[PDB]
UniProtKB/Swiss-Prot annotation, chain C:
Changing residue 455 to R: Resistant to antibiotics salinamide A and B. This is DNA-directed RNA polymerase subunit beta'. It comes from the Bacteria. The RNAP catalytic core consists of 2 alpha, 1 beta, 1 beta' and 1 omega subunit. When a sigma factor is associated with the core the holoenzyme is formed, which can initiate transcription. The rRNA transcription and antitermination complex (rrnTAC) consists of RNAP, NusA, NusB, NusE (rpsJ), NusG, SubB, ribosomal protein S4, DNA and precursor rRNA; S4 is more flexible than other subunits. Changing residue 362 to D: Resistant to antibiotics salinamide A and B. DNA-dependent RNA polymerase (RNAP) catalyzes the transcription of DNA into RNA using the four ribonucleoside triphosphates as substrates. Resistance to the antibiotics salinamide A, salinamide B, rifampicin, streptolydigin, CBR703, myxopyronin, and lipiarmycin can result from mutations in this protein. Disulfide bonds: none annotated. Acetylated on several lysine residues in the presence of glucose. The chain holds residues 329 to 852 of 1407 of the full protein. Mg(2+) binds at residues 132, 134, 136. Zn(2+) 2 binds at residue 486. Belongs to the RNA polymerase beta' chain family. Changing residue 454 to A/C: Resistant to antibiotics salinamide A and B. Co-administration of salinamide and rifampicin or salinamide and myxopyronin suppresses the emergence of resistance to both antibiotics.
From Swiss-Prot, chain D:
One of its GO terms (molecular function) is DNA-directed RNA polymerase activity. Belongs to the RNA polymerase subunit omega family. The RNAP catalytic core consists of 2 alpha, 1 beta, 1 beta' and 1 omega subunit. When a sigma factor is associated with the core the holoenzyme is formed, which can initiate transcription. The rRNA transcription and antitermination complex (rrnTAC) consists of RNAP, NusA, NusB, NusE (rpsJ), NusG, SubB, ribosomal protein S4, DNA and precursor rRNA; S4 is more flexible than other subunits. GO terms for cellular component: cytosol; cytosolic DNA-directed RNA polymerase complex; RNA polymerase complex; transcription elongation factor complex. This is DNA-directed RNA polymerase subunit omega. It comes from the Bacteria. Its EC number is 2.7.7.6. Promotes RNA polymerase (RNAP) assembly. Latches the N- and C-terminal regions of the beta' subunit thereby facilitating its interaction with the beta and alpha subunits. Part of the processive rRNA transcription and antitermination complex (rrnTAC). The complex forms an RNA-chaperone ring around the RNA exit tunnel of RNAP. It supports rapid transcription and antitermination of rRNA operons, cotranscriptional rRNA folding, and annealing of distal rRNA regions to allow correct ribosome biogenesis. Keywords: DNA-directed RNA polymerase, Nucleotidyltransferase, Transcription, Transferase. It is an enzyme of class 2 (transferase).
From Swiss-Prot, chain E:
The chain holds residues 549 to 945 of 1342 of the full protein. DNA-dependent RNA polymerase (RNAP) catalyzes the transcription of DNA into RNA using the four ribonucleoside triphosphates as substrates. Changing residue 132 to M: Resistant to antibiotics salinamide A and B. Co-administration of salinamide and rifampicin or salinamide and myxopyronin suppresses the emergence of resistance to both antibiotics. This is DNA-directed RNA polymerase subunit beta. The RNAP catalytic core consists of 2 alpha, 1 beta, 1 beta' and 1 omega subunit. When a sigma factor is associated with the core the holoenzyme is formed, which can initiate transcription. The rRNA transcription and antitermination complex (rrnTAC) consists of RNAP, NusA, NusB, NusE (rpsJ), NusG, SubB, ribosomal protein S4, DNA and precursor rRNA; S4 is more flexible than other subunits. In pull-down experiments interacts with CedA. (Microbial infection) Interacts (via flap domain) with Escherichia phage lambda antitermination protein Q; this interaction renders bacterial RNAP resistant to transcription pausing and allows it to read through termination signals.
Swiss-Prot record, chain F:
It catalyses: RNA(n) + a ribonucleoside 5'-triphosphate = RNA(n+1) + diphosphate. GO terms for cellular component: cytoplasm; cytosol; cytosolic DNA-directed RNA polymerase complex; membrane; transcription elongation factor complex. The N-terminal domain is essential for RNAP assembly and basal transcription, whereas the C-terminal domain is involved in interaction with transcriptional regulators (such as CRP) and with upstream promoter elements. The gene is rpoA. This is DNA-directed RNA polymerase subunit alpha. Keywords: Acetylation, ADP-ribosylation, DNA-directed RNA polymerase, Nucleotidyltransferase, Transcription, Transferase. The lineage of its organism: Bacteria, Pseudomonadati, Pseudomonadota, Gammaproteobacteria, Enterobacterales. Residues 156-159 are annotated as: Required for interaction with Crp at class II promoters. The chain holds residues 7 to 236 of 329 of the full protein. It comes from the Bacteria. (Microbial infection) ADP-ribosylated on both alpha subunits by the phage T4 protein ModA. ADP-ribosylated on only one of the alpha subunits by the phage T4 protein Alt.
Amino acid sequence: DIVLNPLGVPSRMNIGQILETHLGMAAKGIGDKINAMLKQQQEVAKLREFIQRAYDLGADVRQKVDLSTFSDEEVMRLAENLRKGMPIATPVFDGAKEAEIKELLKLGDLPTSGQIRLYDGRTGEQFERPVTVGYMYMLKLNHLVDDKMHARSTGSYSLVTQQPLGGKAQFGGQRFGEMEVWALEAYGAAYTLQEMLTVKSDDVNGRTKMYKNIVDGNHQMEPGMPESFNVLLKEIRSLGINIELEDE
Amino acid sequence: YSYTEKKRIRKDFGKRPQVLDVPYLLSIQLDSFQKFIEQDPEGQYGLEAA
Amino acid sequence: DMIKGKQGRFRQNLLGKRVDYSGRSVITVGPYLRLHQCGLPKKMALELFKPFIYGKLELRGLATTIKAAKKMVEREEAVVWDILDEVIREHPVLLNRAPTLHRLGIQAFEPVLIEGKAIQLHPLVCAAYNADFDGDQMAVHVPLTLEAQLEARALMMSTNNILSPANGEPIIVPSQDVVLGLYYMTRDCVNAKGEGMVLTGPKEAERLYRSGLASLHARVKVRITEYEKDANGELVAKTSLKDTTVGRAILWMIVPKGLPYSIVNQALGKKAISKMLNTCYRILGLKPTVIFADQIMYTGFAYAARSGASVGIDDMVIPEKKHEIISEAEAEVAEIQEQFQSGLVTAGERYNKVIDIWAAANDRVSKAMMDNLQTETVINRDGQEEKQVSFNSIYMMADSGARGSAAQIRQLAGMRGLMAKPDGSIIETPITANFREGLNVLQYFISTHGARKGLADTALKTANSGYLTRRLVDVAQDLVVTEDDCGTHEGIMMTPVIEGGDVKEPLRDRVLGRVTAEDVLKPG
Amino acid sequence: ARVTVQDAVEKIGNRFDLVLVAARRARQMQVGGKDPLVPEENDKTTVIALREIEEGLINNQILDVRERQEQQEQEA
Amino acid sequence: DVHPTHYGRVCPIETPEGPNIGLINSLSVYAQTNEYGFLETPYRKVTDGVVTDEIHYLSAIEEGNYVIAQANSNLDEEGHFVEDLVTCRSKGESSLFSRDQVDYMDVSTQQVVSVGASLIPFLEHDDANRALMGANMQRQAVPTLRADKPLVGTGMERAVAVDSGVTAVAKRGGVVQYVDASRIVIKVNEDEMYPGEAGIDIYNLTKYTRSNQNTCINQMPCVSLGEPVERGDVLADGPSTDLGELALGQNMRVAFMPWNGYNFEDSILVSERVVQEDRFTTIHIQELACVSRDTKLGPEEITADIPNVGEAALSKLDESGIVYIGAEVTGGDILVGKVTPKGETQLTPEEKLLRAIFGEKASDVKDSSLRVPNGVSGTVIDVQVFTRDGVEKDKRA
Amino acid sequence: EFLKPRLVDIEQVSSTHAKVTLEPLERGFGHTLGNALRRILLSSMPGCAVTEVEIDGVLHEYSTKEGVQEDILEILLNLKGLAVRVQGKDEVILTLNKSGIGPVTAADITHDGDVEIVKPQHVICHLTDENASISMRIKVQRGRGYVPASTRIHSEEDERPIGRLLVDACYSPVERIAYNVEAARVEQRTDLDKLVIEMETNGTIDPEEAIRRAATILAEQLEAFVDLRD
Amino acid sequence: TEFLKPRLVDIEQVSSTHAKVTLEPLERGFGHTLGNALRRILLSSMPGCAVTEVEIDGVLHEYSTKEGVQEDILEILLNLKGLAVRVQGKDEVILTLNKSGIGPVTAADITHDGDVEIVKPQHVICHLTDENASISMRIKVQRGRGYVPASTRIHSEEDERPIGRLLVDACYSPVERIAYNVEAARVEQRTDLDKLVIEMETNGTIDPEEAIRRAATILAEQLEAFVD
RNA sequence: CGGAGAGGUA
């Protein structure tokens, strides 16, 4: 079902997931082995010793034993709930050792080393060595790509400036900050800064003219005078500090 | 033992029995607000002290 | 208060100076992409390039007005898909990482349409972006005018930025996955399927491996024709028999025409692939280097898949004498503690002795672990087993330089051992265990201090480094090269820096790339 | 088309005026006034201009002499 | 920075990765506030050698005076440690101490981490940085379409599910009289009756409600008719909970190998069968509020009559002005038909020219209806109407 | 030269498990045939599956109904796994009508002559109300692959009726396939191997018909390479 | 049910050796299935004609140099691997190579019959120097299937040919290089369809497009009688 | 689309 990068383990230092895989593969195996037992509709006592042995596996382990449950109905309910694997409780610093995982793998009639040689279903050939296969518990985080994607070309603009922002019906353009301006400056990226700061961002006359130009079937630009600097100019003048233009 | 526990037993590999069971994990909020809002026979944390 | 800004005057470039024709998405890996390509979602392409679609639809007669174009694009029919193909075929877009620490943090690619909901990034370029596919989120910016497209293709296309602008040497380099595949290919054994037979070139080498009639690992005598750049720029074909491996020849036929075979006639670590790309660049040029990088990525990925290199619990070996070494270390520290209580050594001296003993024990454990991994796999040839590079997964996993290190794996199978406590001092008792066995409660808690300090330090240094690069850009924004020559005979002296008692940087690197100020002479 | 600009960089070492002349060429093939000298593949004017510059068919000399001559024939 | 006394009170591996790490902690599993406000952690008292089951909530200052043995070094016989030299912490530093020189020991081995951190299995096999990150992502897990037990858990799943309020817990034991997807009626036992009669106990089930994060939370009845239940058990499984066990994510078949470089850094390859099972699929409930206000130009009204709109949008709107419960809606359509009394009717000559060509109408009330955000869709599952006293009720209310 | 593999005994491990064997197959052809057939089976088989469910009681997927232990969500989820085969009509509308307490199963559906329910003991829901009635109009049709119920909604701009609930239709009769090539000994020449394909399917398709359809698809695909138009 | 069949198959050839054939569109997953199936057909078991046994008139050892030859016998064995021979008659036929004089003994010096056709104009087979300045060779060229190593044969062969009859590896199949790649292809809204590109390099004994079409004919024969 | 506070992400 899931393919994980094996390269993330030898660096990010989380091999517990690897163990989570192996202890998973055993557990689902215990789930699968009894599942077949369910398909043959075998007699109840057989499931009884199978579950009793499955829970009894381990050394100095506190789980207690059956039959303390009801002979038939509760055993059947437990087996039906255990057909999709068998839950395993692993205390964080008192969990299962390697030997216990290997024993549970063996009871599952699965490779005790925890690796079964897969066949690459893409092309249909086995690899030079077996791969690590098992059942791991994956969490779907609330960082959905649907909620994270966005883009825009034309839409809302502020009433104080012509920067694009507003709501989520059409959110404004992405914030190309001064860090990325320096990134462009390091290149010979000189025009690109001018389009991405003047015509694509602020100059309303520039925005309209460039949109008309692209619609008309060409990619040409008007230089423009960004409104952001006009706002800064006006508010400097607002404090009794003069700004003027040395006209060319 | 719990009846909902009988419907699905989870195998534990723990090796030391839990000497102290896990207490109510939201005890902080309830204890704080009950100390706040309950009656007091003497001046102690709560509306009475204020 | 809104004249003043943090950081910088707000609405000029930050905060924030947003821009139209821009987008953002999570990034996925596309391992089928050529180095000049990126995978961009179809919906993102549709609603980014909308004016282009409108213009093309009105030009081709598919629409009669802008309203018709709006209806056509919102209906998302199959007709507009061909229009989008036309407008995207040559038009490039810039991918951009939000924390931008250098110019390669923004790079231009050719957008390749993909169904899905996330952007596909070239695997080689993520190192340049300092972006790791762990939930990181990229932005796209679309050049509009001709000047912008030409300028992005000439300078900001990833093919044109194969060399770091900070210290030279290339920044796009096979990192972990293609590295593992290549290393798996070029390994050799002492006995396997198809050993000691003679082949003419890589053709039937590929034939013999891929049919399963010969193993990848084989000391095989192959007649190959390698081309060398000699004379005044001419290719000379030297056809000769060399002993190699089948996978090495399969890699060799991938190698672009015109490189020495000695580069691929060895087990390849990350440094080896970097050196092969360097040789291809200074020997052939740009386009051969781009083709070589793309093909080596493809082959490394494919044979990493075919290898089935897998990390497990039996593929990571705890040393057999690790417990003995730990016991010896415990005995020594017990003797030291007994002497300290005996009043024979001071508390500080005892602390230093304990730290020294534990460091020596940790080094011994690491050496034993690496000796176990280096030749764990031994294969008989005629009744006698011979040492070889181990088929053990983690040994390739690290030795290839894919992802990890001697110290990094030293804590998986060995012991992560000594570390710092609050105030930065080293704990007397190290992490006696590792990740392959149970960490004691106190041991994990102690490791938590190091992890917390590292994470807090990363956050604080992120803030401080952002502010520092802000200052540095402020001070040097006006510096641009404007003249070819100034005729200044003054300059600076370059010496190979010998700080302490040994040279720490050779003279060649600092002098490399400079222009002489006076004509230097010979010593004598 | 062409994706690498190495040949154009070799032709125009500055590779900044290269952007200028490539933009000029591409704009007046995109905007009426001339036709490309290298046959088309439904490619945009960008890569067409790149492939021209790699072949040494268009540069600043060719561009400005063509501009001069077309000025004399248009003026009278 | 974490502290030596930071141990066992607040989780050292639970803290945000953002620029507030080490300031926002999470309380340890067993830690509790003292009478004065300090954090105290339980410790089993060690009389001479025997570690008794009695506990003392040692405060941070009181902890330093004594020496605390670890939960490790298991106990044989009544209460004696197996090791003569046991790992202990006197002021925060690990050390070796005699079994007869200890004063307290950890009540459990899980009381040094938070609830989020205690759920990670094989925590003693991950790096503190990486396990901290994983515990951080556990809180960000969205509840999957159908909750399913983890094959490899810790055992805190049940405690977290029960102690959280998302679990319908039987207030009084008895025999389940009536099971429904929305209601659970328990015939209470006779020995748990109040004097006189109180009859049944009713549990109404929270079904598909936006919790706080535009995420669905619903409680799943895990019982059947006639099943004998007792006080304190799970009558209905909450979101991300199955059979009273926490069900943050789902168990999946996994192979660890670099398949063709489509999984390159930590990238993940999903089988089509994952989508076939409709697992890792989520229900997201967005709440959109339309407020009918009283303006100085006139009070706003909620009605189906919206000036100059197509009838297709109003087709899903009732005569009360609120979309049906169950209608499939997309962005741009009308959910609540709000109108606002226009101050004055002024028409620009350009507006007159446009309305002459397109046949637009003129109204003395302006559209202000709550339209679906452009980029979202879905089904209307709950409509809440808030009307204060002095305002006439309408059909929907 | 060549000897064609010939279909031999098709045994039934169960109603859902079947092993089909090709004995006279030359060396080097076993894995090719096995891979090709496995890919075709998991990719291109026709199958019957549910698309629209019309429950009288509820109005949308997220609304519960009285007297059922299962939400309408799990009603759709369980109806997804409805193992059903149709013969004459490409689209059929099954009608489930059941009152009274008890587990409402697949066999309780009113079965027509053109529709066969290969899984009668498949539990649909549990009606726990003594006098409630469950009424479902389940649309089951033929298809291939897996169609999420988010593509037909764009084809008509939202379903006009409200009571119909769309379910992502998985027209995949087979859910597990494996193939094993073993060294067969036979009087025919001296070098042939047997290919055994073990199949776990929902029982709505005959294994022989499944293999025949897969081979037909493979041949129709290879037709282009057999005769190059250019 | 409806199905999709490719439109406007594309081919690009380099001589009669290096052919790149592109098929589009292919139903999801079908492209690589066809590619790998026909690939294995061409690789592991593909009918053809190749050299099987050779004669030794000098030193019967395989690690010494032939008298009058400046190189070892091994390298002439490697040279005879790539010779392009096409048999139109009886399966196993004899070819005699008799050339005296210093220089390159090439493919032109072989006898030309009606049972053996050489479509390989020139190729160095051996080099002669003035020690004896003569070479005499007799080889068996046979029809065969796939690739059969000589090391594989000797293990499975109990009867030994007379001394001097050296067994040589057989490159029976007409294709020496085969490779397949599959990429995304876009038709209508769908972009999960797959472009299928096959690249193949043959020994020149058959047109590569003919090799593909006859391999497809082989597989269609294998799959045909299943269809009723 | 005027501005604060919080969490999470990288």
